[PDB]
Every structure is written in C-alpha cells, then in structure tokens.
Write a protein that binds this ligand. Structure first.
Ligand SMILES: CN1CCC2(CC1)c1ccccc1N(Cc1ccc(C(=O)NO)s1)[C@@H]2c1cccc(Cl)c1
Ligand SMILES: [Cl-]
Ligand SMILES: [K+]
Ligand SMILES: [K+]
Ligand SMILES: [K+]
Ligand SMILES: [Zn+2]
Length: 409
C-alpha cells in the first residue's frame, strides 16, 4: 500500500527552529529528496486546530494545563528583551523548563509542531490512507505530563498513541530503538494493557534518564524490573544493554523479543521511535550500530522485521546528534519502508547526490557512515522477558502457541 511522510514549509521551519536540533530535519528531508524518494511517498500535512481551545484540549489529553501554560509563557518571555522575574525563574524551574530544556523564541511552536505531525500521521493510518507514515520531526519520548525532559517539551508519541487506541479491541505495540529509555511513553501507559511498551537502550550509573533497568530499593533482596501496574502489570518491557554493542549482537538481542510481542499481542498498530543516537558515529559514542545495507544495520534489521508483520505502523525520529549520519540512517529507513510496503525495489547510489547540503556529508560523501566495525546477560534478559510476556498473556486472557514463542528464543 501507501507510505506517507510528514512535511510542509511551516513544519520544516518550526522543526529547524530549536538550538539543540538546528537544521537536522532539513538535512534529513533534503537527503530523502536528493535520492528521488519524495515521488514514492504520500505527503501528510501536519494537523491544525480550528481554535486555541481545540489545540489546548488535544495537548492536555496528556499534559497538565499548568505545564502547557508555562511552556506558552516561556516562549512569550524569550521573544522579549526583559529578563525573567525571580517568580518566573521559579515557575519555569518547577516544570524543568531549564538546564537541558531551556527556553528559546519558538520553544512552544517547535514542540507543538512535533505533535501536529504525529497526530496527522496517526490520522492517516486510522482512515487507511497509508499503511505506514514516517515523521522525522517527532519521537520526543522523554516529555512527561508536567515536565520537559531530555530536550523533549511535548510528548508527540503519547498523544499519537492516544489517538490510535481511542479509534475503532485496539492494542498498540510501542518499540523504542533510541539509545535512551522511552520513560515518558512507558509512564503514560503504565496502567494500560492496551498499549504495550518495549524500550531497548543503554542503562548505566549516571546515564540519562536512569530508568529502564533493575529497580534500586532498600533491602539486600535481588533487584527486579518494574513492568507496569494494575491492569497494566507486565505491559512495560525493557532491555538495557552495555556500551559497545554492534549491529549483529543488538539485532540478536531484540529480534526474538519483537517476534514474540507481535505473535502474543497481535497489535492493531505499531509505533516505532527510531532515534539515531545508537549509531557508532553519534557523539555519545555508546553503541556501534551502522546504517549499512549489504552485516545489516540493526536499525534496518528491526524496521524490516516490524514491516513484515503488515500492521499499520508509525515510524518516528528522536535522538541523533550527528546530523549528517542521522540523515544517512533515516534516508535508508525511508527507502526500506518504500521497498517493503510498495514492493518496489529502490536503488540508492552509494555516493551522496549533489544538493544544497552536499558539503555537510564530508569527508567521504558516501551513504554508508564513515565507520569500520571491528571485533550472556542478554540470554538472562531473554528468559526474564519471555516470562514477563507469559505473565502479560495470562493476565490479559490471550491465547498463543507458547512452544512457538519459546522456540523464537
Ligand atoms: C512525576 N513522576 C511520577 C512518578 C513516575 C515518574 C514521573 C511515574 C509517572 C507515571 C506513572 C508511573 C510513574 N512512576 C513509576 C515508574 C514508572 C516507570 C518506572 C521504571 O523504572 N521503569 O523502567 S518507575 C515514575 C517514577 C516513580 C519513582 C521513581 C522513578 Cl525514577 C520514577
Ligand atoms: Cl520539508
Ligand atoms: K521535502
Ligand atoms: K530506547
Ligand atoms: K502499558
Ligand atoms: Zn536518545
């Protein structure tokens, strides 16, 4: 069927207006355009609201009115020469609108743009206009009800998933491939069995945001994983991985888990956060994934497997602090999505085509990232996860082969 992609003139300008992500969104969409992919894609315009009240209702489906009010005020304050008052500094500090989530003149418009894009993408799936929709301006998984976190101001993902589950029993499987734990999405749906969250990430002492690993409590008892609560018990899945993992080991770590979640949950929709900060070339320098398509990119391995399910899917961006390598990865994800969904082979030249941002792709100007890969707790994680999935299934009265599922591992 049809693959949609979110873009527009205003949308691009807003997505390029933040100090942390600068013109990343422009490199991504211009590289997709340089490879002649735009004619294969259905343009999905960002959602717009008939009034301020309708916009406030949509965003406050998740966020608190006082947080939305403070974010709106932070934008007003940064569009003026006047320094903040003592009480304004306190208000903004109370919502963590500082440190990693500072103010800037477009902070509200920028944050809301991601929401507009991901809501339009979910709408395009719900009405069956597209089988898959991509939004490289979204995936801000850390934003919480009343707190900015990890340069995430509004949780476009939580709001898109809310629109999906609220449609016509609808289950959503959320897969978070970002280097960082998908805490804001996991927390939003902590009490729901209808949205199952799965995050693979780095976890280590002092690494942001600290969650998605063993629960640290006062007793000498063996630590265990919190995995949701009430009717949501066992519905939040996490795989924390040590630094240094390559394409093949990360692919082997997640593949059986993805296969099992799909078979047991039978989701109506899949939402994938594809944060590019696991790339070997990300300045975090934690994981050693690639965008290679020959050893297969772990990212391309995961997207190909997800798309093989033929479940309507939303693919989102997220982290990725090496802008040219993020564009390299996300162009290949976009081409792979065209190939799997349209059944139309896409031949991408290994040389970056000439375009405005061509100089940004030095020094080799090739599509492969400039990295040469070289030379379990995971098996333990696999047994724990498999037991969690059996627990989730039993609690939610789902029937499944279980021998078939045990075999995948
Ligand atoms: C405002 N505040 C409320 C409480 C939090 C976060 C936001 C929250 C919000 C919504 C639903 C559940 C939860 N909690 C319970 C958990 C959900 C996910 C957890 C985890 O460790 N997963 O890996 S712990 C969070 C929490 C509680 C205590 C310590 C830590 Cl680190 C995190
Ligand atoms: Cl654009
Ligand atoms: K474009
Ligand atoms: K993640
Ligand atoms: K859940
Ligand atoms: Zn990240």
């Amino acid at each position: 069927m049809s693959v949609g992609i979110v873009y527009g003139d205003q949308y691009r300008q807003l997505c390029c207006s933040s100090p942390k992500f600068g013109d990343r969104y422009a490199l991504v969409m211009d590289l997709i355009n340089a490879y002649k992919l735009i004619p294969e894609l259905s343009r999905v315009p960002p959602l717009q609201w008939d009034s301020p009240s309708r916009m406030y209702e949509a965003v406050t489906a998740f966020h608190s009115t006082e947080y939305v009010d403070a974010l709106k005020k932070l934008q007003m304050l940064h569009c003026e020469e006047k320094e903040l008052t003592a009480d304004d500094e306190l208000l903004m500090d109370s919502f963590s609108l500082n440190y990693d989530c500072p103010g800037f003149p477009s902070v509200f418009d920028y944050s809301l743009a991601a929401v507009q894009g991901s809501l339009a993408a979910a709408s395009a799936l719900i009405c069956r206009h597209c089988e898959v929709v991509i939004n490289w301006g979204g995936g801000w998984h850390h934003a919480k009800r009343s707190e900015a976190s990890g340069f995430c101001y509004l949780n476009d993902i939580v709001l898109a998933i809310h629109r999906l589950v609220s449609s016509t029993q609808t289950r959503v499987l959320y897969v978070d491939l970002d280097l960082h734990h998908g805490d804001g999405v996991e927390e939003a749906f902590w009490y729901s069995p209808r949205v199952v969250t799965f995050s693979v990430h780095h976890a280590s002492p002092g690494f942001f945001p600290g969650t998605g690993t063993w629960n640290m409590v006062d007793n000498d008892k063996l630590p265990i994983f919190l995995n949701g609560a009430g009717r949501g018990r066992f519905s939040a899945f996490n795989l924390p991985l040590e630094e240094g993992i390559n394409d093949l080991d990360w692919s082997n770590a997640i593949g059986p888990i993805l296969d099992s979640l799909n078979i047991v949950i039978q989701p109506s929709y899949v939402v994938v956060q594809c944060g590019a900060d696991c790339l070997a070339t990300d300045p975090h320098r934690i994981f050693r994934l690639t965008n290679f398509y020959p050893s297969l990119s772990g990212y391309l391995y995961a997207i190909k497997k997800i798309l093989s399910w033929k479940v309507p899917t939303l693919i989102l961006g997220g982290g990725g602090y090496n802008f040219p390598d993020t564009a390299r990865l996300w162009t290949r994800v976009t081409a792979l999505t065209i190939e799997e969904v349209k059944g139309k082979k896409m031949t991408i030249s290994p040389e970056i085509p000439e375009h405005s941002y061509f100089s940004r792709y030095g020094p080799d100007f090739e599509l492969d990232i400039d990295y040469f890969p070289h030379k379990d707790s995971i098996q333990k994680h696999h047994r724990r996860i498999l037991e969690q999935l059996r627990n989730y299934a039993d609690l939610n009265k789902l029937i499944y082969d279980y021998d078939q599922v045990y075999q995948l591992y």
